[PDB]
């Protein structure tokens, strides 16, 4: 039953499962006519490429029935792969007059509670972005897409045959769609790195090998948990496209109480391992692993990277004028095993004040790095002057040698201590390549909200504070992005997806 037919040419490996079309009459209050959750393979041909734009076109092969909208001037909006039902639910019973504004309103992918995981959620936590972006084995990917702007207006003519609509003779419009998530990818020059001392460390002279970093893994966190259904422009040059959390600029205290109102951390538990002797997270491929034809299984999942929801703030040229902070910006967390040479330990071969012998450092065990930069086998050593310790000195405990590094997804400018800004925008790929790991990282991750910040326990953080009270924190959520002295050498590439 149809007063007329219409169709939609769509423009952009991606699998398109579903298509939703919304015909919005112009001019004032009115009735939207929608055809939601159509089976893509029933209504469209397979994607093909155009020489000019070198982009994909999705050509209709079946007509869309029109009834209420016949004779009206409409604009057409499109959602592809609405697989969490979010667009359908947001747009239901929306008047034609309100539809354009509603199409740029917010959808919630993870609740505030869901934005934090625990150990029981690993190794495959539900993430905000994962709910609208799925990898189908190693074959292809199903990703939600929306149009940035609707079709040019057109008048739906009555009595147009399905054949003429499909052929584009009458009642055909054109829409461009873009993916609702961004992709993070990480690679590494080598799977191991040699660390040189830059000063005397125990018996290790400056310039000599201090340690080896092995078993490098990664996770991604602090993308958003909500998003504008389709991209929303800001009002100033410093932030082209705004996100629901753009206005949030944390302080040391408001980070813990308010960060989950905007950001997802469930992904920190991806590929988590409950054995603390083992490094948690996803493997990092070498550049060589991409050239490999026919990969295994868990290497395949690592190569294709991870999804996250957009996250932008007002950009600036310094700490004062940039609203990007460590507590509101998307980050890659790199985890690795740091194995120091036993000779690096200033307490080696010495005797404690209680006349017991200082034990030799055992590879893979905890070690402690004092405020003075020296290495100790225990807290007893750290504070005992007879073994090179210092009374009242604090130290960082590296739990079974676990070290942590941050990489920001879209550093600008580059390269070391001037990347003040890091916008993450949908339908882009952020490729972080590790060229080297240059020194000792951090022993825990303070960029995770702690529901009771007065104590070090935090079940929502796989890398909680292991240190005694009064120990300086490695970093703070209210800090700006750039590192005064780089822990990692990286090159970040951003390209259209
Ligand atoms: Ca706590």
């Amino acid at each position: 039953a149809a007063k007329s037919y219409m169709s939609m040419t769509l423009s952009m490996k991606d699998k398109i499962e579903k298509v939703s079309i919304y015909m919005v009459p112009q001019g004032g209050p009115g009735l939207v006519e929608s055809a939601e959750d159509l089976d893509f393979g029933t209504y469209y041909e397979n994607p093909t490429i155009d020489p000019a734009t070198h982009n994909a076109i999705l050509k209709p092969k079946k007509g869309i029935k029109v009834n209420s909208a016949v004779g009206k001037t409409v604009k057409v909006y499109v959602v592809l792969n609405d697989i969490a039902g979010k667009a359908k639910a947001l747009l239901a019973n929306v008047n034609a007059a309100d539809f354009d504004a509603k199409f740029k309103e917010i959808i919630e992918l993870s609740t505030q509670a869901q934005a934090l995981g625990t150990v029981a959620d690993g190794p495959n936590p539900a993430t905000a972005a994962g709910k609208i972006a799925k990898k189908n084995g190693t074959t292809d990917e199903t990703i939600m897409m929306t149009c940035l702007q609707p079709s040019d207006a057109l008048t739906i003519e009555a009595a147009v045959s399905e054949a003429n609509a499909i052929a584009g003779i009458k009642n055909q419009a054109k829409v461009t769609v873009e993916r609702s998530v961004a992709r993070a990818m990480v690679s590494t020059k080598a799977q191991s790195y040699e660390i040189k001392a830059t000063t005397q460390i125990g018996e290790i002279a400056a310039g000599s090998v201090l340690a080896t970093i092995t078993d490098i893994r990664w996770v991604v966190a602090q993308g958003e948990r909500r998003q504008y259904l389709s991209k929303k422009r800001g009002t100033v040059p410093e932030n082209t496209w705004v996100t629901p959390g753009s206005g949030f600029v944390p302080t040391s205290s408001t980070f813990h109480t308010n960060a989950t109102e905007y950001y997802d951390y469930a992904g920190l538990w991806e590929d988590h391992n409950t054995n603390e002797a083992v490094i948690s997270g996803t493997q990092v491929p070498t550049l060589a692993d991409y050239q490999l034809q026919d990969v295994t299984g868990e290497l395949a999942n690592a190569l294709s990277g991870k999804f996250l929801l957009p996250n932008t703030h007002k950009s600036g040229a310094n700490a004062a004028s940039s609203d990007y902070k460590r507590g509101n910006t998307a980050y890659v967390l790199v985890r690795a095993k740091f194995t120091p040479k036993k000779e690096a330990f200033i307490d080696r071969g010495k005797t404690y004040s209680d006349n017991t012998a200082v034990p030799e450092y055992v590879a893979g065990e905890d070690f402690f790095v004092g405020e003075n930069g020296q290495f100790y086998v225990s807290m007893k050593s750290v504070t005992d002057p007879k073994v090179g310790g210092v009374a009242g000195m604090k130290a960082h405990k590296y739990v079974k040698g676990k070290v942590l590094y941050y990489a920001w997804l879209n550093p600008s400018t580059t390269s070391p201590d001037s990347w003040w800004n890091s916008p993450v925008v949908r339908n882009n790929i952020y490729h972080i390549h590790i060229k080297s790991i240059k020194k000792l990282g951090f022993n825990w991750n303070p960029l995770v909200p702690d529901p009771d910040p007065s104590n070090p326990e935090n079940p929502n953080n796989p890398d909680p504070n292991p240190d005694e009270p009064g120990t300086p924190v490695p970093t703070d959520p209210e800090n700006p992005l750039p590192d005064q002295d780089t822990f990692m050498s990286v090159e970040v590439t951003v390209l259209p997806w």
Side-chain angles (χ1 to χ4, degrees), residues 222 245-256 258-259 262-263 265 313 323-329 447 476-480:
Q222 217 163 237
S246 295
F248 179 66
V249 177
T251 70
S252 293
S253 52
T254 66
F255 172 75
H256 297 290
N258 298 129
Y262 311 102
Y263 306 120
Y265 301 89
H313 299 281
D323 281 346
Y324 288 92
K325 306 298 176 180
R326 295 200 163 208
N328 72 6
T329 304
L447 305 186
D476 198 279
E478 79 183 354
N479 295 342

PDB file of all heavy atoms in Angstrom, residues 222 245-256 258-259 262-263 265 313 323-329 447 476-480:
ATOM      1  N   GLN A 222      38.741   6.946  28.820  1.00  0.00           N
ATOM      2  CA  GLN A 222      38.345   8.343  28.916  1.00  0.00           C
ATOM      3  C   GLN A 222      37.904   8.962  27.577  1.00  0.00           C
ATOM      4  O   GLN A 222      37.934  10.177  27.409  1.00  0.00           O
ATOM      5  CB  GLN A 222      39.486   9.156  29.573  1.00  0.00           C
ATOM      6  CG  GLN A 222      38.978  10.241  30.499  1.00  0.00           C
ATOM      7  CD  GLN A 222      40.030  10.790  31.478  1.00  0.00           C
ATOM      8  OE1 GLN A 222      39.824  10.745  32.675  1.00  0.00           O
ATOM      9  NE2 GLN A 222      41.116  11.319  30.968  1.00  0.00           N
ATOM     10  N   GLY A 245      30.809  16.432  27.000  1.00  0.00           N
ATOM     11  CA  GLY A 245      31.713  16.757  28.084  1.00  0.00           C
ATOM     12  C   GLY A 245      32.669  17.909  27.853  1.00  0.00           C
ATOM     13  O   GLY A 245      33.559  18.137  28.683  1.00  0.00           O
ATOM     14  N   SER A 246      32.498  18.646  26.754  1.00  0.00           N
ATOM     15  CA  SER A 246      33.447  19.716  26.392  1.00  0.00           C
ATOM     16  C   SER A 246      33.634  20.772  27.470  1.00  0.00           C
ATOM     17  O   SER A 246      34.737  21.290  27.645  1.00  0.00           O
ATOM     18  CB  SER A 246      33.004  20.428  25.100  1.00  0.00           C
ATOM     19  OG  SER A 246      33.044  19.555  23.983  1.00  0.00           O
ATOM     20  N   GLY A 247      32.560  21.101  28.180  1.00  0.00           N
ATOM     21  CA  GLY A 247      32.617  22.139  29.190  1.00  0.00           C
ATOM     22  C   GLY A 247      33.252  21.691  30.500  1.00  0.00           C
ATOM     23  O   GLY A 247      33.513  22.513  31.360  1.00  0.00           O
ATOM     24  N   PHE A 248      33.487  20.393  30.660  1.00  0.00           N
ATOM     25  CA  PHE A 248      34.041  19.872  31.899  1.00  0.00           C
ATOM     26  C   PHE A 248      35.569  19.988  31.988  1.00  0.00           C
ATOM     27  O   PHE A 248      36.295  19.415  31.179  1.00  0.00           O
ATOM     28  CB  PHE A 248      33.644  18.422  32.059  1.00  0.00           C
ATOM     29  CG  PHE A 248      34.183  17.794  33.291  1.00  0.00           C
ATOM     30  CD1 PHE A 248      33.766  18.224  34.548  1.00  0.00           C
ATOM     31  CD2 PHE A 248      35.103  16.773  33.206  1.00  0.00           C
ATOM     32  CE1 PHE A 248      34.261  17.638  35.700  1.00  0.00           C
ATOM     33  CE2 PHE A 248      35.604  16.185  34.356  1.00  0.00           C
ATOM     34  CZ  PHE A 248      35.175  16.616  35.607  1.00  0.00           C
ATOM     35  N   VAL A 249      36.042  20.725  32.989  1.00  0.00           N
ATOM     36  CA  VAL A 249      37.468  20.943  33.199  1.00  0.00           C
ATOM     37  C   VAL A 249      37.749  20.587  34.647  1.00  0.00           C
ATOM     38  O   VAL A 249      37.445  21.367  35.546  1.00  0.00           O
ATOM     39  CB  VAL A 249      37.871  22.396  32.887  1.00  0.00           C
ATOM     40  CG1 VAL A 249      39.334  22.631  33.166  1.00  0.00           C
ATOM     41  CG2 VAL A 249      37.576  22.696  31.427  1.00  0.00           C
ATOM     42  N   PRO A 250      38.310  19.393  34.884  1.00  0.00           N
ATOM     43  CA  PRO A 250      38.380  18.907  36.267  1.00  0.00           C
ATOM     44  C   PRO A 250      39.424  19.597  37.128  1.00  0.00           C
ATOM     45  O   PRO A 250      40.451  20.051  36.631  1.00  0.00           O
ATOM     46  CB  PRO A 250      38.746  17.432  36.106  1.00  0.00           C
ATOM     47  CG  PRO A 250      39.478  17.360  34.792  1.00  0.00           C
ATOM     48  CD  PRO A 250      38.821  18.403  33.919  1.00  0.00           C
ATOM     49  N   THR A 251      39.124  19.664  38.419  1.00  0.00           N
ATOM     50  CA  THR A 251      40.121  19.920  39.450  1.00  0.00           C
ATOM     51  C   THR A 251      40.436  18.589  40.103  1.00  0.00           C
ATOM     52  O   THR A 251      39.753  17.597  39.848  1.00  0.00           O
ATOM     53  CB  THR A 251      39.619  20.889  40.511  1.00  0.00           C
ATOM     54  OG1 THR A 251      38.605  20.234  41.283  1.00  0.00           O
ATOM     55  CG2 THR A 251      39.048  22.157  39.872  1.00  0.00           C
ATOM     56  N   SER A 252      41.447  18.573  40.964  1.00  0.00           N
ATOM     57  CA  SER A 252      41.866  17.353  41.641  1.00  0.00           C
ATOM     58  C   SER A 252      40.710  16.673  42.350  1.00  0.00           C
ATOM     59  O   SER A 252      40.639  15.445  42.385  1.00  0.00           O
ATOM     60  CB  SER A 252      42.979  17.665  42.648  1.00  0.00           C
ATOM     61  OG  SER A 252      44.141  18.073  41.961  1.00  0.00           O
ATOM     62  N   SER A 253      39.802  17.471  42.906  1.00  0.00           N
ATOM     63  CA  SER A 253      38.649  16.928  43.614  1.00  0.00           C
ATOM     64  C   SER A 253      37.428  16.621  42.711  1.00  0.00           C
ATOM     65  O   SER A 253      36.780  15.581  42.863  1.00  0.00           O
ATOM     66  CB  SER A 253      38.242  17.897  44.722  1.00  0.00           C
ATOM     67  OG  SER A 253      38.076  19.203  44.208  1.00  0.00           O
ATOM     68  N   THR A 254      37.102  17.508  41.779  1.00  0.00           N
ATOM     69  CA  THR A 254      35.910  17.294  40.962  1.00  0.00           C
ATOM     70  C   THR A 254      36.115  16.157  39.973  1.00  0.00           C
ATOM     71  O   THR A 254      35.138  15.642  39.446  1.00  0.00           O
ATOM     72  CB  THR A 254      35.466  18.567  40.170  1.00  0.00           C
ATOM     73  OG1 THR A 254      36.443  18.907  39.184  1.00  0.00           O
ATOM     74  CG2 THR A 254      35.235  19.745  41.106  1.00  0.00           C
ATOM     75  N   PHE A 255      37.367  15.760  39.716  1.00  0.00           N
ATOM     76  CA  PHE A 255      37.614  14.623  38.834  1.00  0.00           C
ATOM     77  C   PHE A 255      36.947  13.384  39.411  1.00  0.00           C
ATOM     78  O   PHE A 255      36.247  12.654  38.696  1.00  0.00           O
ATOM     79  CB  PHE A 255      39.108  14.369  38.634  1.00  0.00           C
ATOM     80  CG  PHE A 255      39.422  13.102  37.881  1.00  0.00           C
ATOM     81  CD1 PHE A 255      39.243  13.027  36.505  1.00  0.00           C
ATOM     82  CD2 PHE A 255      39.925  11.990  38.547  1.00  0.00           C
ATOM     83  CE1 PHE A 255      39.535  11.869  35.805  1.00  0.00           C
ATOM     84  CE2 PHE A 255      40.241  10.828  37.865  1.00  0.00           C
ATOM     85  CZ  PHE A 255      40.040  10.753  36.485  1.00  0.00           C
ATOM     86  N   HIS A 256      37.145  13.161  40.708  1.00  0.00           N
ATOM     87  CA  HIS A 256      36.667  11.927  41.333  1.00  0.00           C
ATOM     88  C   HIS A 256      35.160  11.884  41.524  1.00  0.00           C
ATOM     89  O   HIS A 256      34.547  10.824  41.396  1.00  0.00           O
ATOM     90  CB  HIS A 256      37.377  11.723  42.654  1.00  0.00           C
ATOM     91  CG  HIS A 256      38.841  11.536  42.476  1.00  0.00           C
ATOM     92  ND1 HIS A 256      39.373  10.400  41.899  1.00  0.00           N
ATOM     93  CD2 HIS A 256      39.883  12.374  42.692  1.00  0.00           C
ATOM     94  CE1 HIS A 256      40.685  10.526  41.818  1.00  0.00           C
ATOM     95  NE2 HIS A 256      41.021  11.718  42.289  1.00  0.00           N
ATOM     96  N   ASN A 258      32.950  13.730  39.597  1.00  0.00           N
ATOM     97  CA  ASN A 258      32.166  14.092  38.395  1.00  0.00           C
ATOM     98  C   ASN A 258      32.608  13.502  37.049  1.00  0.00           C
ATOM     99  O   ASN A 258      31.855  13.574  36.060  1.00  0.00           O
ATOM    100  CB  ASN A 258      32.133  15.617  38.228  1.00  0.00           C
ATOM    101  CG  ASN A 258      31.460  16.325  39.397  1.00  0.00           C
ATOM    102  OD1 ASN A 258      32.012  17.256  39.967  1.00  0.00           O
ATOM    103  ND2 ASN A 258      30.261  15.887  39.748  1.00  0.00           N
ATOM    104  N   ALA A 259      33.801  12.930  36.981  1.00  0.00           N
ATOM    105  CA  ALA A 259      34.320  12.469  35.690  1.00  0.00           C
ATOM    106  C   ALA A 259      33.448  11.406  35.021  1.00  0.00           C
ATOM    107  O   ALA A 259      33.350  11.396  33.790  1.00  0.00           O
ATOM    108  CB  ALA A 259      35.721  11.945  35.840  1.00  0.00           C
ATOM    109  N   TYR A 262      30.676  11.978  32.356  1.00  0.00           N
ATOM    110  CA  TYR A 262      31.066  12.224  30.966  1.00  0.00           C
ATOM    111  C   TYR A 262      31.899  11.111  30.322  1.00  0.00           C
ATOM    112  O   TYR A 262      31.789  10.913  29.121  1.00  0.00           O
ATOM    113  CB  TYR A 262      31.868  13.539  30.866  1.00  0.00           C
ATOM    114  CG  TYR A 262      31.221  14.707  31.572  1.00  0.00           C
ATOM    115  CD1 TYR A 262      31.675  15.125  32.811  1.00  0.00           C
ATOM    116  CD2 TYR A 262      30.139  15.387  31.000  1.00  0.00           C
ATOM    117  CE1 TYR A 262      31.082  16.191  33.472  1.00  0.00           C
ATOM    118  CE2 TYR A 262      29.544  16.453  31.652  1.00  0.00           C
ATOM    119  CZ  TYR A 262      30.020  16.852  32.883  1.00  0.00           C
ATOM    120  OH  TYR A 262      29.417  17.902  33.525  1.00  0.00           O
ATOM    121  N   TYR A 263      32.730  10.400  31.092  1.00  0.00           N
ATOM    122  CA  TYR A 263      33.749   9.520  30.492  1.00  0.00           C
ATOM    123  C   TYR A 263      33.590   8.036  30.856  1.00  0.00           C
ATOM    124  O   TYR A 263      33.088   7.689  31.924  1.00  0.00           O
ATOM    125  CB  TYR A 263      35.156  10.029  30.875  1.00  0.00           C
ATOM    126  CG  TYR A 263      35.321  11.483  30.514  1.00  0.00           C
ATOM    127  CD1 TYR A 263      35.603  12.437  31.479  1.00  0.00           C
ATOM    128  CD2 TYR A 263      35.138  11.908  29.209  1.00  0.00           C
ATOM    129  CE1 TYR A 263      35.713  13.778  31.140  1.00  0.00           C
ATOM    130  CE2 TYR A 263      35.257  13.236  28.861  1.00  0.00           C
ATOM    131  CZ  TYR A 263      35.532  14.164  29.813  1.00  0.00           C
ATOM    132  OH  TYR A 263      35.615  15.482  29.412  1.00  0.00           O
ATOM    133  N   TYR A 265      35.402   4.335  31.536  1.00  0.00           N
ATOM    134  CA  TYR A 265      36.665   3.710  31.985  1.00  0.00           C
ATOM    135  C   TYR A 265      36.612   2.187  31.976  1.00  0.00           C
ATOM    136  O   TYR A 265      37.550   1.536  32.416  1.00  0.00           O
ATOM    137  CB  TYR A 265      37.015   4.191  33.392  1.00  0.00           C
ATOM    138  CG  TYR A 265      37.174   5.668  33.453  1.00  0.00           C
ATOM    139  CD1 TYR A 265      36.085   6.483  33.714  1.00  0.00           C
ATOM    140  CD2 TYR A 265      38.413   6.266  33.224  1.00  0.00           C
ATOM    141  CE1 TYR A 265      36.209   7.838  33.745  1.00  0.00           C
ATOM    142  CE2 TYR A 265      38.554   7.628  33.264  1.00  0.00           C
ATOM    143  CZ  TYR A 265      37.443   8.414  33.518  1.00  0.00           C
ATOM    144  OH  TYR A 265      37.544   9.773  33.561  1.00  0.00           O
ATOM    145  N   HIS A 313      37.546  19.511  23.606  1.00  0.00           N
ATOM    146  CA  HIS A 313      37.531  20.646  24.516  1.00  0.00           C
ATOM    147  C   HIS A 313      38.061  21.858  23.783  1.00  0.00           C
ATOM    148  O   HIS A 313      38.603  21.743  22.689  1.00  0.00           O
ATOM    149  CB  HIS A 313      38.389  20.387  25.758  1.00  0.00           C
ATOM    150  CG  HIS A 313      37.931  19.224  26.569  1.00  0.00           C
ATOM    151  ND1 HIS A 313      36.870  19.301  27.442  1.00  0.00           N
ATOM    152  CD2 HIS A 313      38.375  17.948  26.621  1.00  0.00           C
ATOM    153  CE1 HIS A 313      36.684  18.122  28.005  1.00  0.00           C
ATOM    154  NE2 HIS A 313      37.581  17.281  27.520  1.00  0.00           N
ATOM    155  N   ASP A 323      41.675  23.888  27.566  1.00  0.00           N
ATOM    156  CA  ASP A 323      40.798  23.158  28.486  1.00  0.00           C
ATOM    157  C   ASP A 323      41.031  21.642  28.476  1.00  0.00           C
ATOM    158  O   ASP A 323      40.306  20.892  29.126  1.00  0.00           O
ATOM    159  CB  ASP A 323      39.328  23.434  28.160  1.00  0.00           C
ATOM    160  CG  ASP A 323      38.831  24.786  28.687  1.00  0.00           C
ATOM    161  OD1 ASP A 323      39.507  25.410  29.529  1.00  0.00           O
ATOM    162  OD2 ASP A 323      37.740  25.217  28.258  1.00  0.00           O
ATOM    163  N   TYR A 324      42.017  21.183  27.720  1.00  0.00           N
ATOM    164  CA  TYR A 324      42.419  19.780  27.787  1.00  0.00           C
ATOM    165  C   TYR A 324      43.240  19.507  29.047  1.00  0.00           C
ATOM    166  O   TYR A 324      44.291  20.119  29.260  1.00  0.00           O
ATOM    167  CB  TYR A 324      43.212  19.404  26.537  1.00  0.00           C
ATOM    168  CG  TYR A 324      42.357  19.295  25.287  1.00  0.00           C
ATOM    169  CD1 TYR A 324      42.162  20.387  24.446  1.00  0.00           C
ATOM    170  CD2 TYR A 324      41.752  18.092  24.947  1.00  0.00           C
ATOM    171  CE1 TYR A 324      41.369  20.291  23.319  1.00  0.00           C
ATOM    172  CE2 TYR A 324      40.953  17.984  23.821  1.00  0.00           C
ATOM    173  CZ  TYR A 324      40.768  19.078  23.007  1.00  0.00           C
ATOM    174  OH  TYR A 324      39.980  18.949  21.888  1.00  0.00           O
ATOM    175  N   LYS A 325      42.748  18.603  29.884  1.00  0.00           N
ATOM    176  CA  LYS A 325      43.434  18.208  31.108  1.00  0.00           C
ATOM    177  C   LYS A 325      43.610  16.708  31.091  1.00  0.00           C
ATOM    178  O   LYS A 325      42.934  16.010  30.348  1.00  0.00           O
ATOM    179  CB  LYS A 325      42.647  18.622  32.354  1.00  0.00           C
ATOM    180  CG  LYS A 325      42.277  20.094  32.426  1.00  0.00           C
ATOM    181  CD  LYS A 325      43.514  20.974  32.458  1.00  0.00           C
ATOM    182  CE  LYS A 325      43.155  22.453  32.443  1.00  0.00           C
ATOM    183  NZ  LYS A 325      44.370  23.308  32.486  1.00  0.00           N
ATOM    184  N   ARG A 326      44.473  16.199  31.961  1.00  0.00           N
ATOM    185  CA  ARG A 326      44.734  14.778  31.986  1.00  0.00           C
ATOM    186  C   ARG A 326      43.492  14.026  32.445  1.00  0.00           C
ATOM    187  O   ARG A 326      43.278  12.895  32.043  1.00  0.00           O
ATOM    188  CB  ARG A 326      45.944  14.469  32.872  1.00  0.00           C
ATOM    189  CG  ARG A 326      47.225  15.060  32.315  1.00  0.00           C
ATOM    190  CD  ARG A 326      48.492  14.398  32.876  1.00  0.00           C
ATOM    191  NE  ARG A 326      49.646  14.713  32.031  1.00  0.00           N
ATOM    192  CZ  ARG A 326      50.726  13.948  31.888  1.00  0.00           C
ATOM    193  NH1 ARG A 326      50.842  12.795  32.545  1.00  0.00           N
ATOM    194  NH2 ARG A 326      51.699  14.342  31.077  1.00  0.00           N
ATOM    195  N   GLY A 327      42.658  14.686  33.241  1.00  0.00           N
ATOM    196  CA  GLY A 327      41.396  14.111  33.683  1.00  0.00           C
ATOM    197  C   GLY A 327      40.150  14.339  32.812  1.00  0.00           C
ATOM    198  O   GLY A 327      39.037  14.094  33.275  1.00  0.00           O
ATOM    199  N   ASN A 328      40.305  14.805  31.577  1.00  0.00           N
ATOM    200  CA  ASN A 328      39.138  14.936  30.692  1.00  0.00           C
ATOM    201  C   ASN A 328      39.435  14.620  29.229  1.00  0.00           C
ATOM    202  O   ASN A 328      38.608  14.883  28.337  1.00  0.00           O
ATOM    203  CB  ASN A 328      38.536  16.350  30.819  1.00  0.00           C
ATOM    204  CG  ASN A 328      39.391  17.418  30.187  1.00  0.00           C
ATOM    205  OD1 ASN A 328      40.392  17.131  29.539  1.00  0.00           O
ATOM    206  ND2 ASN A 328      38.974  18.683  30.356  1.00  0.00           N
ATOM    207  N   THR A 329      40.601  14.021  28.998  1.00  0.00           N
ATOM    208  CA  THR A 329      41.106  13.758  27.661  1.00  0.00           C
ATOM    209  C   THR A 329      41.314  12.272  27.462  1.00  0.00           C
ATOM    210  O   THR A 329      41.803  11.580  28.352  1.00  0.00           O
ATOM    211  CB  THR A 329      42.430  14.499  27.416  1.00  0.00           C
ATOM    212  OG1 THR A 329      42.238  15.898  27.638  1.00  0.00           O
ATOM    213  CG2 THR A 329      42.950  14.281  26.007  1.00  0.00           C
ATOM    214  N   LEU A 447      44.536   8.477  36.714  1.00  0.00           N
ATOM    215  CA  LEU A 447      43.521   9.046  35.821  1.00  0.00           C
ATOM    216  C   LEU A 447      42.312   8.105  35.729  1.00  0.00           C
ATOM    217  O   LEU A 447      41.864   7.711  34.638  1.00  0.00           O
ATOM    218  CB  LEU A 447      44.131   9.327  34.450  1.00  0.00           C
ATOM    219  CG  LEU A 447      45.382  10.230  34.489  1.00  0.00           C
ATOM    220  CD1 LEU A 447      45.793  10.562  33.071  1.00  0.00           C
ATOM    221  CD2 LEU A 447      45.178  11.496  35.312  1.00  0.00           C
ATOM    222  N   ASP A 476      48.437  14.007  37.966  1.00  0.00           N
ATOM    223  CA  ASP A 476      47.169  14.472  38.515  1.00  0.00           C
ATOM    224  C   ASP A 476      46.185  14.813  37.389  1.00  0.00           C
ATOM    225  O   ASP A 476      46.601  15.350  36.362  1.00  0.00           O
ATOM    226  CB  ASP A 476      47.403  15.695  39.403  1.00  0.00           C
ATOM    227  CG  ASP A 476      46.234  15.972  40.330  1.00  0.00           C
ATOM    228  OD1 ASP A 476      45.238  16.587  39.880  1.00  0.00           O
ATOM    229  OD2 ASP A 476      46.299  15.552  41.504  1.00  0.00           O
ATOM    230  N   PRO A 477      44.880  14.533  37.589  1.00  0.00           N
ATOM    231  CA  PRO A 477      43.860  14.823  36.573  1.00  0.00           C
ATOM    232  C   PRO A 477      43.697  16.306  36.240  1.00  0.00           C
ATOM    233  O   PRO A 477      43.229  16.610  35.145  1.00  0.00           O
ATOM    234  CB  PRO A 477      42.572  14.271  37.200  1.00  0.00           C
ATOM    235  CG  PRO A 477      42.829  14.212  38.630  1.00  0.00           C
ATOM    236  CD  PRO A 477      44.281  13.861  38.755  1.00  0.00           C
ATOM    237  N   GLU A 478      44.072  17.213  37.139  1.00  0.00           N
ATOM    238  CA  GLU A 478      43.964  18.633  36.830  1.00  0.00           C
ATOM    239  C   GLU A 478      45.177  19.156  36.031  1.00  0.00           C
ATOM    240  O   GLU A 478      45.192  20.305  35.602  1.00  0.00           O
ATOM    241  CB  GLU A 478      43.781  19.450  38.117  1.00  0.00           C
ATOM    242  CG  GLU A 478      45.066  19.702  38.908  1.00  0.00           C
ATOM    243  CD  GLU A 478      44.814  20.464  40.207  1.00  0.00           C
ATOM    244  OE1 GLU A 478      43.661  20.903  40.442  1.00  0.00           O
ATOM    245  OE2 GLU A 478      45.778  20.623  40.990  1.00  0.00           O
ATOM    246  N   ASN A 479      46.174  18.313  35.791  1.00  0.00           N
ATOM    247  CA  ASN A 479      47.348  18.752  35.043  1.00  0.00           C
ATOM    248  C   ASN A 479      47.062  18.878  33.560  1.00  0.00           C
ATOM    249  O   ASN A 479      46.168  18.212  33.056  1.00  0.00           O
ATOM    250  CB  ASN A 479      48.508  17.779  35.220  1.00  0.00           C
ATOM    251  CG  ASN A 479      49.026  17.730  36.647  1.00  0.00           C
ATOM    252  OD1 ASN A 479      48.785  18.629  37.459  1.00  0.00           O
ATOM    253  ND2 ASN A 479      49.732  16.670  36.956  1.00  0.00           N
ATOM    254  N   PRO A 480      47.855  19.697  32.852  1.00  0.00           N
ATOM    255  CA  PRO A 480      47.780  19.768  31.395  1.00  0.00           C
ATOM    256  C   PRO A 480      48.435  18.543  30.761  1.00  0.00           C
ATOM    257  O   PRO A 480      49.082  17.770  31.467  1.00  0.00           O
ATOM    258  CB  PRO A 480      48.538  21.046  31.074  1.00  0.00           C
ATOM    259  CG  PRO A 480      49.531  21.154  32.142  1.00  0.00           C
ATOM    260  CD  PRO A 480      48.864  20.630  33.385  1.00  0.00           C
TER     261      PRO A 480
END
